[PDB]
Amino acid sequence: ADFEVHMLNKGKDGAFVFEPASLKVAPGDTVTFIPTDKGHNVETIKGMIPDGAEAFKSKINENYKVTFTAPGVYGVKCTPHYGMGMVGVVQVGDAPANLEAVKGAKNPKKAQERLDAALAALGN
Ligand SMILES: [Cu+2]
Question: How is the cofactor bound?
Fold first, then answer.
C-alpha cells in the first residue's frame, strides 16, 4: 500500500509541519514525502529508527519515496526546520519493538512536543 506525507509551511498545529504527522502503515508499504511548499525535506531522526533500519535523508524539494521494510516506529524530521518543530512519526506494523526508545529519544522542545502528540495519536 502506498501513502503520502506532506511537508508544509503551515498546517493543523501551526508552522513547519508534516501532515499527517502520525501515520500507520504495514511493513513493506511505501510513503512518499511530498514537499507541497518549497524548502523542505525528510530525514530520519538519529536514535528514532528500529532494529536493522537504514537511516535516510532526501534533498530539499524532492518527492521522496521510502519503502518501509524494517518494522517499528520511525521519527522523521525536516532537516532545516527540525528545531522549529517539523517532525513526524511513521509506525510500521503492529506492536513496534522500539516504542520505548522512540518515546525516550532526545529532541528540541518544539519537536518533542509534536513528536509526543504524534506518538499519542498512534494509541499504542
Ligand atoms: Cu521544512
Answer: Binds 1 copper ion per subunit.
